[PDB]
C-alpha cells in the first residue's frame, strides 16, 4: 500500500458505485499489508546483505486485518459513507469478466477479484522484514498520505489522529 | 503582409454566410417555396389553419386558386 | 428538418468561433509590426483545428477544493446560451420567429452572466472569486443603461420583434437618428462581453487566468468559444438594430452577405479596439456607466419619447 | 538645467472650452489612437523567417567553444592554464603531462557549458588562440551530461568550425 | 498599381517551377518569395539573395531534402548549414 | 504572475479589492553574488555586475569601473570615456523602453511593447557588434573598455538615432493624452518630496516630487 | 415546441463536449496536482471567507433601478393610445423621478465606493 | 496489420496537434527573460509557431525555466509544474537554470533545475540568444513529433 498503490485507492475507488460489494461480507479474509517505504528498503538491504544470497523473504506489515474491519477503515480515513452489501461469488465473479473486456486498464478482473477475497498466508519460518532491520510501518500511521486525496473539500483538513485505529485480528 | 489577413477573413466569411442562407432555403422548401408564413398575431394563425382545412392536403401552403370556385 | 436547421445554425458558429481566433490573432500581430500564426496550414489556416484538438486531448482537471457540480455545470451553462442567442436573428428570416426577440436576447445575456459567476465561485479558489466579484460589479454597470438604449431605440420601430428592424430601414440607417445611443450601445456592448479595455473578469495583468484560472483542457475551451460566439453574436445584433440592410424577399442572399459584412466589420473593429487602448479599473467604469452614460441615456429616453408624438411619426404595430 | 513635463494649464477661451467638450463627447484622442494602430496595420512586418533566415551577427559573436590546431594539425594548446585561471565561473579543468615526443600537451581539458557564462575571458587569456569561441549558438541538447565537454568533443568541435573560425579572427585581430 | 502586385504575385506563382514547386515552397519554407540564386551547397542547401529586402529578409537558405542520413523534407533545422555558408548567412561577412 | 516581475512574492491584506497592507518577500532571486565576489579577482567579478541589473549591463559596469579606477588612481583614456558615455545612454534608452512598455502591457497597453522592442533588437545588436555579446557584453572594463568600436559602428547608431525620435512620438500618441491612460496614472502612487528624501529614494522617483537633483 | 428542441440541442451539445473532454484524455490526477492554485505558494485563508463589497449602496440601488425599465418596457406599446398628451405627461414623470432618485444618491455621496 | 496503420495515424495526428499547439507559462526568473521577452518581439514572433504564452498553469503546455533557481524558489517551481496538466513538457534555459552557471557553488542557489522538475530541452548560454532558444523549441516540438504514445499502448 502507498500513493500509487492499488490496495488503500482500489478500495477508495468503489465508492461511487453507491455500495461496497463484499463477498460473504469481507469477515472471512484477513490481510497483512505492507508499506511500500518497507518494501524498498528491504529491497536495497537485500541488495547489500553478503548472507541473503539464496534466502527467501516474506514481507509482511505488523498487523493481520479482517476485510471488512480493514475497508471500513479505509472509507472512515477518506471520511466516506460506509454501504457495505454482501455479494456471492459467482456473481461478483460475473461483474469482474464483465469489466475485463476493457482494452485499456479494467477497473477490476476476475483475478483481482480472487486475490481481493483471498486470505494472507502466514508463513512464520521465513525470514521477514525484521531480518533485514526494517521496522514495518503501520497503516495507521500512513494511510491519511493515500487516502487524503479521497477526501471532499469539507474533510480535507482533517488530523492523523482523529479517526480510531481499526480493530486488529493479531494472532 | 496585411493580405495574410484576408483567408481568415474569407473563412470566416464563408461559415457566417451559412445560417442565413440555409434557413431561407429549409423555410422555402417546407412552404412551397414562398416564404414561409408568419404569424405574430391570431388573425394570422387563424388564416393559416383556414387555409390548412381548405386544401384537403392538411397543409397550409397548398393555395387553392379561382378555379376551386367552379 | 427543423433538426436540420439547428445543426445548420450551430456548426457554421462554431467554425466561425474558431477562425475569429487566428483573425484575431493575425490583426493583433500585424497592428503590432509582427505577422501571427502563419506556420501551421497555409497562413495559419490550420492553426484553430491544432488548438482545438489540442486541448481536447489534454487531461481535465479538478481542484480538490471545488465544488464538482456547478465547476461542472457553469461552462455548459456558458456555451448552451452562446449558442442560443442565436435564433431569433434575422439574416433575413429567423430559425424562431419571436413576437419579443429582443427581450428574449436581454433575458439570455443576463441569465449568461452566472456561468462566470459560478465557475468563479465553484472554483474555490481567490483569483476566481475576485473575477466574479468583477462580473457581478460589471452586470451592476452596464444593464440599466443598455436597456434604456435599447428601449430608446426601439421606439422608432414600433415593436420588440427583430423582422420589423428591417422594415425600419428600408431607406435610412437607424445610425443617422440615434448615432449618440449607437455609441453608448457599442460601448455597453464592449462592457457586456468583457473585452478590452473592459476585460476585467478575466484581469490577465491583474489577476492570472481571473475566473477560469482553475480550468483547463476541454472545460477551458467551452469557456473560450462562449466568449468568442457572444463576440459576434452581440455584433451582429449591433449591424441588425443600427445599420440596415436592404432585404429582397426573392434574394435573401443580398442581405445576408451585406450583413455578414457589416458584422464582420464590428468584429474586426472590437479586435482594433483592444489592440489601442489600456484598461479600465472596473470601479471607474461604474462611474463611467451611471455617471455619464445615465444621464445621457434618461435625457435621450426622453428626447426619443417625445420625437414621434411631436412630430407625428409613431411607427405601426401597437 | 531642468524642464518641467506637466505644468501647462488650458486656456478659458469659449471655442477652446467647446473643443475640450467636443473631445469629451466624440472621444477625439481615442480616435487618433486607433488611427496610429491602423497605420502600423499597413506596415510591413518585422518578423524574419526563421530557420530560413537568420538574425545578423558578427565576427566577434562568442559560440560554442573550439579548440584550434596549427595549420600542420599540431594542437596549439601548450597546458598554460590561463584560460584555466581566469575563468569566472570555473568551468574549465585542465590535465597535463609531457606526450611521447616530450611536447607539453593536455590530457584532460573539460569545460562545463551549464557552468560557463560565455563572456570569452578564456579566448582572451590564451596566448597561442588555442580556445576559442566559435559562432555556433544552435547547439541545444537533450540531456544535460550532454553539454559537459571534454577533449576530444572540442577538438572535433574545432575541425568541424574551423574554417570559419579562421575567418572570424582575420577579420578582428586587428581590434585585439 | 492594384494589377501590378497581381503581376508580381503571379511572377512569383511562375518563377517557382510551376504550380507543384510553389505550393513545395509554400508549405516548406512558408514563403513563396524568389531571388537571385547565390550558390549551392555540397549537401543540397541552395542559398538565393534580394537585396530590395530589408536588413534580415535579404538572405535565405532553401533546406535539403534529404542530409547526411534522414530525410529532412518537413523536419530541417539551422544546425545543417555548414560553417563558410553559415558565416555568410548570418550577415558576418558580404562575401559568398 | 505576469505583473510579479517573476520574483516577487507580494503578500497583500485586502478589504474588498482595497489595499489593507503591502509586505513584499524578496530574496527568491537571491544569489548570494556579494559572497562570490569576494572569491574571485577584479576581473573575474565584473560580469557579475552585467548579471545584476539585466537591463541596464554597460551602466553596471561603468560603476564598478569607476570604483576600482578610483581605487587604483588611474584614468581612462578620452576616447574610452566618450564610449562610457555614449553606451551609457544607449542603455539608457534600452532600460527606459523596457520600464515604459513594460508599465503600459501591465497596465493594458499590449501594443507599444511590440514597436519599442525592435528598437531594443536593434541595440542589441550595437551591443553584439561591439562585444561579442547582445546584453551581457563585458565590454566596459576598470581600465576603459575591451575593444575598439567596429569601423562602422558610429554610422549604424547615427542612422538609429535619426530615426527614433518618431517611435518616441508613436509612443506618446498612444499613451500621453489618452483619458483612460491618464485615469490609470494620474494621482495614482503620489509621494511627497520629504518622504521621497527620507525612504531613501533616488532618480525619477525623486525629479517627479520636483526635487532638483541628478548625478 | 421548436425552442424547446433548440435548447435540448445546444445543452446536450455543450453536454457531449464536456463528456469528451472528460473522458477522451489520460487523467493522472495526484494530490499536489490538485491543490488551490495561488502564484507560486499555498494560500493563507480560504476563498470562502468573506469578501467585503465596496458597492453595497449601488448594488441595492440596481435593483430599483432595475424595476424602473419593467416600467418603460411597454412604452412602444403606449405611444399608439389614442390620449397621448396624458401618456406623454406619465412617460416624462416616470423619467424624472428616475434622474431625480439618480441625482440624489450622487450628491449625497452614494455612488462613491466605501474606503 | 490494420490497428497499427489506424494507431499510427491517430499519433501523427495527436502529436501534430500538440506540438503546432505549444502554450508556455509566463513564467521568467531572472536575465534569460529579457531574451525570452525578445523571442516574443516582432523579429522572431513566437506567435508565428502556434507559441502563445499563458499565465494560468493550468492552460500551459511548456514551462521555461529562464533564470536561476533558488532555494526560496523551488518549492514554488516545483508548485507551479505539479498543477500543470499532462501531457506537459519543460525547457532548461541558460547557464543558471541548466546547471547553476555562474552561481554553481553559492548556498542559496539550485545547481541545475533538473533536480526539481525534469527536463527535456537544454538550451546553453548567458544568456541564449533569442534564436537559440526558437531552436530549441522547435527541437521540442521535433521531440513531440517523434513520440509514439498509441503504437506502445496498441502493442501492450
Ligand atoms: C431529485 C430532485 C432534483 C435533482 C436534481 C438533479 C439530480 C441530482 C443527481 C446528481 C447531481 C449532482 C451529482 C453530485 O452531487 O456529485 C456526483 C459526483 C460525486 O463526486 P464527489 O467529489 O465525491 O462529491 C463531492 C461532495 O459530495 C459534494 O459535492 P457538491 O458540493 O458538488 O454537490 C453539489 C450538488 C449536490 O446536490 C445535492 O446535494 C443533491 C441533489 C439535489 C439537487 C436539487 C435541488 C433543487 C434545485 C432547484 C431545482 C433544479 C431542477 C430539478 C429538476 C428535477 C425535475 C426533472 O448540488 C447540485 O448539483 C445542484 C445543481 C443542480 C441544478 C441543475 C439546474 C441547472 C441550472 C441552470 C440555470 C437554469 C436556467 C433557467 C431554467 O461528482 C462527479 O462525479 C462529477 C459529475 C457530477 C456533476 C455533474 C453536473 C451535475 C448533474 C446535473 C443535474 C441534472 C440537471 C438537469
Ligand atoms: C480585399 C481587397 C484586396 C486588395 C488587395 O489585395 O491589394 C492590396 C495591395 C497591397 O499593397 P501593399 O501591401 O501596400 O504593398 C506591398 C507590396 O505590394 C508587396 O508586394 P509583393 O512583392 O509582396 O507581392 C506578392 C504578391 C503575392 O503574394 C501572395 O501570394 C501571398 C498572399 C496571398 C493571399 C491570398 O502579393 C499580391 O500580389 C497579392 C495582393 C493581395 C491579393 C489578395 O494594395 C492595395 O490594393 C490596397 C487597396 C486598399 C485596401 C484597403
Ligand atoms: C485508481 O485507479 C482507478 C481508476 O483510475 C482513476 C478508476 O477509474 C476506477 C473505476 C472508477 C471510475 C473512475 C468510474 C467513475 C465514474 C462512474 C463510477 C461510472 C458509473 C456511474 C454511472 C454510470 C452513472 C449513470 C447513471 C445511472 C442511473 C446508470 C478504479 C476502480 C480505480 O481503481
Ligand atoms: C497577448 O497575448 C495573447 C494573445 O496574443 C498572442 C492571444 O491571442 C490570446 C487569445 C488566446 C489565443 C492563443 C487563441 C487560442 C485559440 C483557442 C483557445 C482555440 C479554440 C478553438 C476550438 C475550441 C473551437 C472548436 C473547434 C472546431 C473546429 C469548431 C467546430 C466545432 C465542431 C462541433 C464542428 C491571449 C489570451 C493572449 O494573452
Ligand atoms: C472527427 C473528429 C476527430 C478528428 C478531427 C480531425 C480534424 C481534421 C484533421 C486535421 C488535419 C490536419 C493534420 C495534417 C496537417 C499536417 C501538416 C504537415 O506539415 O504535417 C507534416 C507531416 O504529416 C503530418 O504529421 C500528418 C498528421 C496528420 C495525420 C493524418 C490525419 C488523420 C486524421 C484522422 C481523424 C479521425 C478522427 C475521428 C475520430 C472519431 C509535417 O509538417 P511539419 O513540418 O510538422 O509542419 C510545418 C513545419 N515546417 C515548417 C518545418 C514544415
Ligand atoms: C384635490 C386636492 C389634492 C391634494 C393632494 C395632492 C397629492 C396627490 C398629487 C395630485 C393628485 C393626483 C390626481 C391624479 C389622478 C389621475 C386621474 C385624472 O387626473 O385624470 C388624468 C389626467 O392626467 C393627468 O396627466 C394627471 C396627472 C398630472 C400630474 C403629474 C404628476 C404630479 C403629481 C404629484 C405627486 C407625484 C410625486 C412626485 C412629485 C413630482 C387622466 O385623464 P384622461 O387621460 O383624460 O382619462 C383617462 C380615461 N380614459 C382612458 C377613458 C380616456
Ligand atoms: C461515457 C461514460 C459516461 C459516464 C458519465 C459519468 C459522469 C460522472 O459523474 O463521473 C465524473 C465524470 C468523468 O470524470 P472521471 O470519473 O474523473 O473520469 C473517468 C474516466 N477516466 O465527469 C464528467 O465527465 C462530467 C461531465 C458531465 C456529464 C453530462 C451531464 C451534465 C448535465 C448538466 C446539465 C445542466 C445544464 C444547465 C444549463 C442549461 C439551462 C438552459
Ligand atoms: C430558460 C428560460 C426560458 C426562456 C423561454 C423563452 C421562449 C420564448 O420566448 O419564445 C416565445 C414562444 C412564443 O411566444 P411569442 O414570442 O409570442 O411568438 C409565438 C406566438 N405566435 O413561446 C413558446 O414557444 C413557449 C413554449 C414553451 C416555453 C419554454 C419553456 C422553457 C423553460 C426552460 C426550463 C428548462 C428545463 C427545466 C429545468 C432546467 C434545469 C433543471
Ligand atoms: C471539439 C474539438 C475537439 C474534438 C473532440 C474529440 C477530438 C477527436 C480526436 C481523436 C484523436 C485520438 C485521441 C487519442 C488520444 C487519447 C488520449 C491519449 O493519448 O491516451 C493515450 C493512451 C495511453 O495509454 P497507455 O500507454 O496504455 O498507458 C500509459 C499511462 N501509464 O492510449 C490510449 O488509450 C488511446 C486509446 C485510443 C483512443 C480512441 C480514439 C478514437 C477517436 C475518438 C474521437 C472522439 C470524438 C467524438
Ligand atoms: S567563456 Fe568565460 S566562463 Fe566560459 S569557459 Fe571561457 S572564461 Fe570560462
Ligand atoms: S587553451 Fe590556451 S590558455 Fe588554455 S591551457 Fe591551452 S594554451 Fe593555455
Ligand atoms: S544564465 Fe546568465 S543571463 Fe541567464 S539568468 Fe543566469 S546569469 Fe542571467
Redesign the interface.
Known amino acids: 500500500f502507498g500513493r500509487e498503490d492499488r490496495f488503500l485507492n482500489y478500495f477508495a475507488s468503489m465508492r461511487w458505485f453507491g455500495g461496497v460489494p463484499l463477498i460473504s461480507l469481507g469477515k472471512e479474509t484477513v490481510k497483512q499489508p505492507v508499506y511500500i517505504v518497507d518494501v524498498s528498503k528491504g529491497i536495497i538491504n537485500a541488495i547489500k546483505d553478503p548472507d541473503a544470497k539464496g534466502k527467501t523473504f516474506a514481507f509482511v506489515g505488523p498487523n493481520r486485518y479482517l476485510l471488512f474491519d480493514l475497508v471500513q477503515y479505509i472509507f472512515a480515513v477518506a471520511y466516506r459513507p460506509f454501504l457495505p452489501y454482501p455479494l456471492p461469488h459467482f456473481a461478483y465473479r460475473w461483474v469482474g469478466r464483465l469489466f475485463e473486456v476493457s482494452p485499456f486498464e479494467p477497473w477490476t478482473t476476475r483475478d483481482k477479484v480472487e486475490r481481493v477475497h483471498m486470505s494472507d498466508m502466514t508463513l512464520p519460518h521465513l525470514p521477514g522484514l525484521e531480518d533485514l532491520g526494517i521496522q514495518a510501518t503501520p497503516l495507521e500511521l500512513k494511510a491519511i498520505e493515500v487516502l487524503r486525496r479521497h477526501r471532499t473539500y469539507r474533510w480535507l483538513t482533517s488530523e492523523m489522529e482523529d479517526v480510531k485505529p481499526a480493530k486488529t485480528v493479531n494472532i | 503582409?496585411?493580405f495574410?489577413?484576408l483567408?481568415?477573413?474569407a473563412?470566416?466569411?464563408a461559415?457566417?454566410?451559412?445560417?442565413?442562407?440555409?434557413?431561407?432555403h429549409?423555410?422555402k422548401?417546407?412552404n412551397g417555396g414562398k416564404?414561409?408564413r408568419?404569424a405574430?398575431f391570431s388573425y394570422q394563425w387563424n388564416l393559416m389553419e383556414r387555409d390548412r382545412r381548405i386544401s384537403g392536403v392538411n397543409r397550409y401552403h397548398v393555395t387553392k386558386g379561382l378555379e376551386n370556385i367552379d | 428538418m427543423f433538426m436540420i436547421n439547428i445543426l445548420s445554425l450551430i456548426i457554421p458558429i462554431l467554425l466561425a468561433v474558431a477562425f475569429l481566433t487566428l483573425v484575431e490573432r493575425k490583426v493583433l500581430g500585424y497592428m503590432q509590426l509582427r505577422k501571427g500564426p502563419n506556420v501551421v496550414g497555409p497562413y495559419g489556416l490550420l492553426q484553430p483545428i491544432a488548438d482545438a484538438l489540442k486541448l481536447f486531448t489534454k487531461e481535465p482537471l479538478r481542484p480538490a477544493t471545488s465544488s464538482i457540480s456547478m465547476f461542472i455545470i457553469a461552462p455548459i451553462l456558458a456555451l448552451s446560451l452562446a449558442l442560443t442567442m442565436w435564433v431569433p436573428l434575422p439574416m433575413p428570416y429567423p430559425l424562431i420567429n419571436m413576437n419579443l426577440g429582443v427581450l428574449f436576447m436581454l433575458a439570455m445575456s443576463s441569465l449568461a452572466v452566472y456561468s462566470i459567476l459560478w465557475s468563479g465561485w465553484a472554483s474555490n479558489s481567490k483569483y476566481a472569486l475576485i473575477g466574479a466579484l468583477r462580473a457581478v460589479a460589471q452586470t451592476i454597470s452596464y444593464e440599466v443603461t443598455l436597456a434604456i438604449i435599447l428601449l430608446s431605440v426601439l421606439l422608432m420601430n414600433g415593436s420588440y420583434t427583430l423582422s420589423t428592424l428591417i422594415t425600419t430601414q428600408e431607406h435610412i440607417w437607424m445610425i443617422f437618428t440615434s448615432w449618440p445611443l449607437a455609441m453608448m450601445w457599442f460601448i455597453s456592448t464592449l462592457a457586456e462581453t468583457n473585452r478590452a479595455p473592459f476585460d476585467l473578469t478575466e484581469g490577465e495583468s491583474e489577476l492570472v487566468s481571473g475566473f477560469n484560472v482553475e480550468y483547463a483542457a476541454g472545460p477551458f475551451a467551452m469557456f473560450f468559444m462562449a466568449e468568442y460566439a457572444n463576440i459576434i453574436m452581440m455584433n451582429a445584433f449591433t449591424a441588425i438594430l443600427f445599420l440596415g440592410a436592404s432585404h429582397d424577399p426573392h434574394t435573401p442572399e443580398l442581405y445576408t452577405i451585406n450583413f455578414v459584412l457589416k458584422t464582420l466589420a464590428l468584429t474586426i473593429t472590437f479586435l482594433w479596439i483592444r489592440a489601442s487602448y489600456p484598461r479600465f479599473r472596473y470601479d471607474q467604469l461604474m462611474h463611467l456607466l451611471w455617471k455619464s452614460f445615465l444621464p445621457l441615456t434618461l435625457a435621450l429616453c426622453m428626447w426619443h419619447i417625445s420625437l414621434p408624438i411631436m412630430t407625428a411619426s409613431i411607427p405601426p404595430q401597437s | 538645467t531642468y524642464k518641467f513635463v506637466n505644468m501647462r494649464e488650458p486656456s478659458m477661451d469659449m471655442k477652446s472650452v467647446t473643443d475640450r467638450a467636443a473631445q469629451t463627447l466624440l472621444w477625439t484622442e481615442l480616435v487618433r489612437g486607433l488611427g496610429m494602430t491602423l497605420s502600423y496595420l499597413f506596415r510591413e512586418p518585422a518578423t524574419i523567417n526563421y530557420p530560413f533566415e537568420k538574425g545578423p551577427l558578427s565576427p566577434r559573436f562568442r559560440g560554442e567553444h573550439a579548440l584550434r590546431r596549427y595549420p600542420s594539425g599540431e594542437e596549439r594548446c601548450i597546458a598554460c592554464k590561463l584560460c584555466e585561471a581566469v575563468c569566472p565561473a570555473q568551468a574549465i579543468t585542465i590535465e597535463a603531462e609531457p606526450r611521447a615526443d616530450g611536447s607539453r600537451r593536455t590530457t584532460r581539458y573539460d569545460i562545463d557549458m551549464t557552468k560557463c557564462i560565455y563572456c570569452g575571458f578564456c579566448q582572451e587569456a590564451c596566448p597561442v588562440d588555442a580556445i576559442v569561441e566559435g559562432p555556433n549558438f544552435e547547439f541545444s541538447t537533450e540531456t544535460h551530461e550532454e553539454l559537459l565537454y571534454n577533449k576530444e568533443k572540442l577538438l572535433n568541435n574545432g575541425d568541424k568550425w574551423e574554417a570559419e573560425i579562421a575567418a572570424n579572427i582575420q577579420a578582428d585581430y586587428l581590434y585585439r | 498599381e492594384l494589377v501590378q502586385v497581381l503581376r508580381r504575385g503571379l511572377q512569383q506563382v511562375s518563377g517557382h517551377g510551376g504550380l507543384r514547386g510553389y505550393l513545395r515552397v509554400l508549405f516548406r519554407a512558408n514563403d513563396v518569395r524568389v531571388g537571385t540564386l547565390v550558390g549551392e551547397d555540397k549537401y543540397g542547401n541552395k542559398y538565393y539573395e534580394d537585396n530590395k529586402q530589408f536588413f534580415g529578409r535579404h538572405r535565405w537558405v532553401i533546406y535539403t531534402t534529404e542530409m547526411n542520413g534522414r530525410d529532412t523534407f518537413w523536419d530541417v533545422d539551422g544546425s545543417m548549414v555548414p560553417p563558410e555558408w553559415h558565416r555568410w548567412l548570418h550577415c558576418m561577412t558580404d562575401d559568398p | 504572475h505576469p505583473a510579479a516581475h517573476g520574483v516577487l512574492r507580494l503578500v497583500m491584506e485586502l478589504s474588498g479589492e482595497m489595499v489593507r497592507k503591502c509586505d513584499p518577500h524578496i530574496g527568491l532571486l537571491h544569489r548570494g553574488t556579494e559572497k562570490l565576489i569576494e572569491y574571485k579577482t577584479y576581473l573575474q567579478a565584473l560580469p557579475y555586475f552585467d548579471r545584476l541589473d539585466y537591463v541596464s549591463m554597460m551602466c553596471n559596469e561603468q560603476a564598478y569601473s569607476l570604483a576600482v579606477e578610483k581605487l587604483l588612481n588611474i584614468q581612462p583614456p578620452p576616447r574610452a570615456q566618450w564610449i562610457r558615455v555614449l553606451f551609457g545612454e544607449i542603455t539608457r534608452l534600452l532600460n527606459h523602453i523596457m520600464a515604459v512598455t513594460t508599465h503600459a502591457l501591465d497596465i493594458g497597453a499590449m501594443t507599444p511593447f511590440f514597436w519599442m522592442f525592435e528598437e531594443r533588437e536593434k541595440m542589441f545588436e550595437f551591443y553584439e557588434r561591439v562585444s561579442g555579446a547582445r546584453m551581457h557584453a563585458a565590454y566596459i572594463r576598470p581600465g576603459g573598455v575591451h575593444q575598439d568600436l567596429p569601423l562602422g559602428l558610429l554610422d549604424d547608431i547615427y542612422e538609429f538615432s535619426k530615426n527614433f525620435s518618431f517611435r518616441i512620438d508613436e509612443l506618446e500618441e498612444m499613451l500621453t493624452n489618452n483619458r483612460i491612460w491618464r485615469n490609470r496614472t494620474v494621482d495614482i502612487g503620489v509621494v511627497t518630496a520629504e518622504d521621497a528624501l527620507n525612504y531613501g529614494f533616488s532618480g525619477v522617483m525623486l525629479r517627479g516630487s520636483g526635487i532638483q537633483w541628478d548625478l | 415546441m421548436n425552442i424547446m428542441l433548440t435548447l435540448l440541442t445546444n445543452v446536450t451539445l455543450a453536454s457531449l463536449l464536456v463528456l469528451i473532454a472528460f473522458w477522451l484524455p489520460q487523467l493522472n490526477a495526484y494530490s499536489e496536482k490538485t491543490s488551490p492554485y495561488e502564484c507560486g505558494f499555498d494560500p493563507m485563508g480560504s476563498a470562502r471567507l468573506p469578501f467585503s463589497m465596496k458597492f453595497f449602496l449601488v448594488a441595492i440601488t440596481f435593483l430599483l433601478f432595475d424595476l424602473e425599465i419593467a416600467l418603460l418596457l411597454p412604452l412602444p406599446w403606449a405611444s399608439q393610445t389614442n390620449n397621448l398628451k396624458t401618456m406623454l405627461t406619465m412617460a416624462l414623470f416616470l423619467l424624472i423621478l428616475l434622474a431625480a432618485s439618480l441625482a440624489y444618491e450622487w450628491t449625497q455621496k452614494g455612488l462613491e465606493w466605501a474606503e | 496489420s490494420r490497428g497499427e496503420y489506424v494507431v499510427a495515424k491517430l499519433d501523427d495526428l495527436v502529436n501534430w496537434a500538440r506540438r503546432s499547439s505549444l502554450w508556455p507559462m509566463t513564467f521568467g526568473l531572472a536575465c534569460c527573460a529579457v531574451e525570452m521577452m525578445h523571442m516574443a518581439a516582432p523579429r522572431y514572433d513566437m506567435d508565428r509557431f502556434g507559441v502563445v504564452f499563458r499565465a494560468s498553469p493550468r492552460q500551459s503546455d511548456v514551462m521555461i525555466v529562464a533564470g536561476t533557481l533558488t532555494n526560496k524558489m523551488a518549492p514554488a517551481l516545483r508548485k507551479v509544474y505539479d498543477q500543470m496538466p499532462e501531457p506537459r513538457y519543460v525547457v532548461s534555459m541558460g547557464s543558471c537554470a541548466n546547471g547553476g552557471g555562474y552561481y554553481h557553488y553559492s548556498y542559496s542557489v539550485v545547481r541545475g533545475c533538473d533536480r526539481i522538475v525534469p527536463v527535456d530541452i537544454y538550451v546553453p548560454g548567458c544568456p541564449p540568444t533569442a534564436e537559440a532558444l526558437l531552436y530549441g523549441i522547435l527541437q521540442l516540438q521535433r521531440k513531440i513529433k517523434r513520440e509514439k504514445r498509441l503504437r506502445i499502448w496498441y502493442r501492450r
Open positions: 503582409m496585411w495574410e489577413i483567408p481568415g477573413i473563412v470566416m466569411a461559415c457566417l454566410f451559412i445560417p442565413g442562407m440555409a434557413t431561407a429549409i423555410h422548401f417546407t416564404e414561409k408568419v405574430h
